[PDB]
Every structure is written in C-alpha cells, then in structure tokens.
Amino acid sequence: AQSVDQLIKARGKVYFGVCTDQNRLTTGKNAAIIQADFGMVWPENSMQWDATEPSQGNFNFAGADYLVNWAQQNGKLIGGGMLVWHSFLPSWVSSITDKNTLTNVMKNHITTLMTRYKGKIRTWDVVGEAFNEDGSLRQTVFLNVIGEDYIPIAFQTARAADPNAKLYIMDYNLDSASYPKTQAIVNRVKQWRAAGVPIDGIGSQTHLSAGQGAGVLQALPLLASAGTPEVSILMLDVAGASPTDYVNVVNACLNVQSCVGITVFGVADPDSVRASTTPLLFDGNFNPKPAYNAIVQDLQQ
Numbered sequence: 001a002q003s004v005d006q007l008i009k010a011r012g013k014v015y016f017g018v019c020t021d022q023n024r025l026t027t028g029k030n031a032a033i034i035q036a037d038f039g040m041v042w043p044e045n046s047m048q049w050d051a052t053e054p055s056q057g058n059f060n061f062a063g064a065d066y067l068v069n070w071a072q073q074n075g076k077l078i079g080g081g082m083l084v085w086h087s088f089l090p091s092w093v094s095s096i097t098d099k100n101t102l103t104n105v106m107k108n109h110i111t112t113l114m115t116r117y118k119g120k121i122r123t124w125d126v127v128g129e130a131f132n133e134d135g136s137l138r139q140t141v142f143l144n145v146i147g148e149d150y151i152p153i154a155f156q157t158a159r160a161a162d163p164n165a166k167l168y169i170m171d172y173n174l175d176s177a178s179y180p181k182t183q184a185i186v187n188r189v190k191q192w193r194a195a196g197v198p199i200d201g202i203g204s205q206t207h208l209s210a211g212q213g214a215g216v217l218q219a220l221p222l223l224a225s226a227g228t229p230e231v232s233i234l235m236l237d238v239a240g241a242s243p244t245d246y247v248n249v250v251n252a253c254l255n256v257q258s259c260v261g262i263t264v265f266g267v268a269d270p271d272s273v274r275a276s277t278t279p280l281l282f283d284g285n286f287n288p289k290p291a292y293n294a295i296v297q298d299l300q301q
C-alpha cells in the first residue's frame, strides 16, 4: 500500500521510476499504480529512433508527446532515450557510409528530440550499449563510420540542446565489479570527463538472474568511482523476483551517495519481455508481490 517513490524520497533519493508508454497507460491498472507508487516515467519505445525518425527528417512525436503530457499532468519526472543506440535503428541510418553525413544525421536526431522537450526532461540517455562484453567499443554504424569521437560529439551536442538535462551513458552487464565491461566503462568515462565531455551519469541497465543482486553491492560503488555526479539503476528486473535480490539492489543505491534512484522495467509480470520468469514487482492481478513489500519495509527502516 505504501509508495516506494515516496519512501525513497524520504531516504534522500530523487525517485523510484518505471518504464511505460501510451499502450500501458490505457490498459490494466498501470496508470493508477504509477500515480500512486512511482515518481518518474521513461518511454519504453516511443522515443527510440525507429519510432521518432522512421524516415530521415520525418519525425513522429505522437507517442512521446502523449507520455510527456501524461507525466506533466500527473506531476511525474520524465526520462527520455535512447538518443544513440544500434538497436531499433532504421535501415536508412545503418546504410550511411559517409562520416560527415552520419555525424550531421546524429546531431540532428539528438537536437530535434531534445529541443522539442527542452526543460521538461530530467534525464536523457544519450548513448546506450556502446561497449562489448570484453570492454572494447561495440562496432556499430556510429563507431564504424564516425569513429570513437561519436560519443564525445553526442554528449557535446546534447548539452548544447538542453543544458538543464542530466546526460547519461547506459549499459548492461555492469552488475559485477570484476567484469571486463564494468572496468572499461569506468575507465573510459573517467577519461572522457577529464577531457571535458559532459557525461553527468552512468545508468546501469540491470537485468539480473536469481542470486545476482549481491554483486551489485560491489559493482555500483565501482561505477560511482568514475566521478560522474550521478549514477542510477535502470530497466531493473530480476528473474524470480526474489526479495533478496531486489532488496540488495535498493541497498546498493542507498549505499552510494551519487545514486539518485532506481527505475524498474515495467509494472506487472504479464507485460514483461521475459514474463515466464515473473521478474517484476506486481503480479498478473496487479497486486504487489513479496519483493515490493520487502522494498517498502527496507525503506521504512
């Protein structure tokens, strides 16, 4: 019955958030649960590249406008993204082979989305999933055509477009301190910031198997050692939804001063991409699960 967003605010954090979109807000009990329990919303799909720029320079904002308007009406913070990602890319982007062309396409995509919502978006995920598992840079069209400068260019462009937004890089499999990807993103973000690249946060896209929450207690402090002003947990889900794993992720954020909050990947189990693992905090009747109650109790104490 208690609101995890209200309780995490009382502990000095900024939000407990959730991913959603128009399709969810008009079905189930998603809107009522988000109103009650979550302080920030993120677009599942409506701000990805294939949704917003399906043909070059032919932008479609309908889904994204719906979410932003709903969030403002209901007093919720808004996160946006992903601005630069190799998934959900339209084919017209991935066929460009010219550096100047792709650089201008990328800057225009970033600037157009960020200007439309200027001042209304707390956090933008600027670049996502830029690292391979061995810590090398993922060979996406942006890396292949622009070079490693594409990441500085993307963040510099985003800062100019809306200097009020917090700018994040995001990746998954950052859940263990000794994993090569964890080491690499920390080292590269340190170097980028030392050269003045405006990276405000690292977002950890946390998709856990049973028992992996304990590792986050060590991994998240390591991510925070890169020196960004903020870190966060994003797109969180946990196979089996054990209270032990969920409470460990919450405690990791409570233990890390720069952790501003946690976002879960959805509201109810049946709408998960891995629904067979019942990995979310509400069940198929929209009742809170034991893991939700455990987080409430941990935050109350």
Ligand SMILES: O=[N+]([O-])c1ccc2nn[nH]c2c1
Binding pocket: 018, 019, 042, 043, 044, 045, 080, 081, 082, 083, 125, 234, 235, 236, 263, 264, 265, 266
């Ligand atoms: O936190 N999130 O669940 C979330 C969802 C969609 C996104 N797109 N970019 N960043 C995102 C974060």
